Swiss-Prot record:
Protein role: Tumor suppressor that inhibits cell proliferation and promotes apoptosis. Modulates the activity of protein arginine N-methyltransferases, including PRMT3 and PRMT5.
Gene Ontology cellular component annotations, sorted alphabetically: cell junction; cell-cell junction; ciliary basal body; cilium; cytoskeleton; cytosol; glutamatergic synapse; juxtaparanode region of axon
Molecular function per GO: actin binding; cytoskeletal protein-membrane anchor activity; structural constituent of cytoskeleton
Gene: EPB41L3
Biological-process GO terms, alphabetical: actomyosin structure organization; apoptotic process; cortical actin cytoskeleton organization; cortical cytoskeleton organization; myelin maintenance; neuron projection morphogenesis; paranodal junction assembly; protein localization to juxtaparanode region of axon
Protein name: Band 4.1-like protein 3
Amino acid sequence: PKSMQCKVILLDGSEYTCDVEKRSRGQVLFDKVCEHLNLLEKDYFGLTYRDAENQKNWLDPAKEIKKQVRSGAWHFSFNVKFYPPDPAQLSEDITRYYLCLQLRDDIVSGRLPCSFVTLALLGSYTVQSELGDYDPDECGSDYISEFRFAPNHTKELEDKVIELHKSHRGMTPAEAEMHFLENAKKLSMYGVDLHHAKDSEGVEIMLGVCASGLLIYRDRLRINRFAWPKVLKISYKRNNFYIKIRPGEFEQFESTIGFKLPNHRAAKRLWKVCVEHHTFFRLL
Ligand SMILES: CN(Cc1cccc(F)c1)S(N)(=O)=O
């Protein structure tokens, strides 16, 4: 029996290394990672890898790892796949903990835009969780935290994190993580997976996939939102991604909106993440 070494980047930036039989399906690796993380509520999570385009792909747990990574290194990242719309309803604190770690990276990366005050408030709950009660001895008027809070850091943001941290005295890590999530879950891009596309007129848009449905972001004045109940069907042909939208009451025919993706793989990727989120919505 021949085993391949897997390297997984965990959400605190640490690296986990294990071996699986070379014909292993994704689930085998994932089960090992989740056991290492003491994670039971595993269905919200997944493993990603990067292809030679350095684009992110979900490792399909049902398929052989080798037929997915193909020519690439057996190098993966552990990630939230399905963002819970109501994290307070997860059964375990450790589940909320990993969700917070993912959202910290969503914020620092700019995937999850955040006002100055929300950056500072989220940062303040992270500090309370990671370090406990505010301690002036560590701080000082010139303090910069080790923690990454934002896509760009400013002294004003560091100061506001400390001001709000003072107000959390006595808060336990589980409580500070619940507060982090109660705030983050309300942000307009929470759990939104964005895909570059062109509309049928060739205008650059973003397609957003999330729990509630499909977002078409043309510009600030031109946004469309299709809750899952309004989406009949989706398809990809070559580089094309098509959405069928139910008729409004007393209309006879669905409408088709068409999108051009950069290539066939990007269309297939968008299709699969939409199917997977749709199946999530069905079970909520
Ligand atoms: C697997 N499908 C189900 C689906 C229905 C409605 C919305 C969806 F995002 C997915 S499909 N590819 O449309 O035939």
